[PDB]
Structure 1
Amino acid sequence: IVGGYTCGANTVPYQVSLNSGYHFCGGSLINSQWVVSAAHCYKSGIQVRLGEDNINVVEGNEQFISASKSIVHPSYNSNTLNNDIMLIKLKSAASLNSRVASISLPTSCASAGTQCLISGWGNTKSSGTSYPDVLKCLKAPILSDSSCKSAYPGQITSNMFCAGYLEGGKDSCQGDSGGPVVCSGKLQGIVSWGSGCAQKNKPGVYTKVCNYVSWIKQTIASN
């Protein structure tokens, strides 16, 4: 997250870190045994880390649970990033509490202008690299489809939305992928892609979760 703020420990209780020896992506806990992330975060050997603030220090609220299975969306295209969503099942259910909690799926899609909370452990620099170790947060509005498509001609599908600031300075970045965009208490987006980080006229692009609620619910019900 570039241009954000330190969230505070366990203030984003649905935020998970995906670890394969190291943090490589975020995710969102949607019930005691399932996480939503980005399809481009897929790999084998995932351990889901819940209750994290500093990802390099055991602080006492963590739960570390290996994945039993991952399900990448059937229509994910890794060249276009269309349908950049996957589900990860935990081998055992997380213990839910104030600091480890699920986030609700949306009832309807959120509108341009709606404020959202974006979070992650990704790079905090637009030029060069610095990783923060504690969770970073950014409040950002959803941008209109028109301005998203004008920023990224030929790239924005019906399964994507932009959020952030056309002036730059505030955005998600490398290492935030797969993490949440929460608006009005519902998971509306997944950190997906952008051209650089926090650059003018290149806002972040997010998977449009409301298009996937039926797939998520049906997949969970049978897996």
Structure 2
Amino acid sequence: IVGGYTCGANTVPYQVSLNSGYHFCGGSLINSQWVVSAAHCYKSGIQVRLGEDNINVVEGNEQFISASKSIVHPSYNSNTLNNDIMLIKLKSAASLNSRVASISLPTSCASAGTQCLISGWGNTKSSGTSYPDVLKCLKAPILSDSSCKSAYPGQITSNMFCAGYLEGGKDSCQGDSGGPVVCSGKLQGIVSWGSGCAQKNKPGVYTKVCNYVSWIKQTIASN
């Protein structure tokens, strides 16, 4: 997160960190046994880290659970990044509490202009490199489709939306992928891709969650 603020420990209790010897992506706890991340975040031998704040220090609110299975969306297209969503089942159920809660799934699509919350342990620089150890937050609005398409001509699909600032300065970045875009207490997006970070006229591109609720629900019920 570029140009954001320090969330504060356990202020985003549905936020998870995906670890494979190091943090490589984010995710969101949707229930006690399932996390939703980005399909491009797929990898094997993943451990899920809950209740985290400083990912480099055990502060005592954490739960570390291995994934038992991962299911990438049947139509994920790694070339255009269409359908950038994946489901991960925990080896054992998380213990939900104050610092460790799930996030509600949308029942409808959010509209342009709506203010959302984006969080991650991603790079903190548009140019350069500086990774935070603590969770960073950003408030940003959903840009109109027409604005989205003017920014990335020929690349935005119906399962994507842009959020952020056309002037740049504030945005999600490398290390934030898989993480949540939350609006009106619902998970509406998933950090996906972009052109650099926080660049002028190059806002962030997110997975349009609302278009997947059914597949989510069905998938979870059968596994």
Q: Specify if TM > 0.5.
A: yes
Runs of 4 or more, structure 1, over 6 Å off, are none
* Structure 1, unaligned runs of 5 or more: none
Secondary structure of the residue that 2:27 maps to in structure 1?
strand
1:214 matched residue in structure 2 = 214
Distance in 2, Cα, partners of 1:21 & 1:132: 17
The offset of 1:184, in angstroms, is: 0.2
The offset of 1:149, in angstroms, is: 0.3
The offset of 1:51, in angstroms, is: 0.2
1:32 matched residue in structure 2 = 32
The offset of 1:111, in angstroms, is: 0.3
Aligned pair count reads 223
The reply on whether 1:181 has 2:181 as its aligned counterpart is: yes
The offset of 1:150, in angstroms, is: 0.3
Deviation track 1:27-60 (CA, whole Å, cap 9, x = no partner) reads 0000000000000000000000000000000001
Distance in 2, Cα, partners of 1:186 & 1:43: 26
1:22 matched residue in structure 2 = 22
Q: Where does 1:86-125 land on structure 2 (aligned, <5 Å)? A: 86-125=86-125
The offset of 1:154, in angstroms, is: 0.4
Secondary structure of the residue that 2:30 maps to in structure 1?
strand
Deviation track 1:188-223 (CA, whole Å, cap 9, x = no partner) reads 000000000000000000000000000000000001
The offset of 1:167, in angstroms, is: 0.3
The offset of 1:165, in angstroms, is: 0.3
Deviation track 1:72-105 (CA, whole Å, cap 9, x = no partner) reads 0000000100000000000000000010000000
The offset of 1:166, in angstroms, is: 0.3
1:195 matched residue in structure 2 = 195
Deviation track 1:150-182 (CA, whole Å, cap 9, x = no partner) reads 000000000000000000000000000000000
Q: Over aligned residues, Cα RMSD in angstroms?
A: 0.3
Distance in 2, Cα, partners of 1:98 & 1:133: 21
The offset of 1:3, in angstroms, is: 0.2
Distance in 2, Cα, partners of 1:215 & 1:107: 13
Distance in 2, Cα, partners of 1:129 & 1:159: 30
Distance in 1, Cα, partners of 2:48 & 2:89: 9
TM superposition score normalised by structure 2: 1.00
The offset of 1:71, in angstroms, is: 0.2
Identical-pair percentage: 100
The offset of 1:118, in angstroms, is: 0.2
Distance in 2, Cα, partners of 1:56 & 1:117: 23
Secondary structure of the residue that 1:137 maps to in structure 2?
strand
Distance in 1, Cα, partners of 2:221 & 2:170: 38
Distance in 2, Cα, partners of 1:147 & 1:74: 29
Secondary structure of the residue that 1:31 maps to in structure 2?
coil
2:156 matched residue in structure 1 = 156
TM superposition score normalised by structure 1: 1.00
Distance in 2, Cα, partners of 1:46 & 1:150: 37
Distance in 2, Cα, partners of 1:171 & 1:87: 25
Distance in 2, Cα, partners of 1:190 & 1:107: 16
Secondary structure of the residue that 1:218 maps to in structure 2?
helix
The offset of 1:14, in angstroms, is: 0.1
Distance in 2, Cα, partners of 1:61 & 1:114: 32
Distance in 2, Cα, partners of 1:205 & 1:13: 23
Secondary structure of the residue that 2:212 maps to in structure 1?
helix
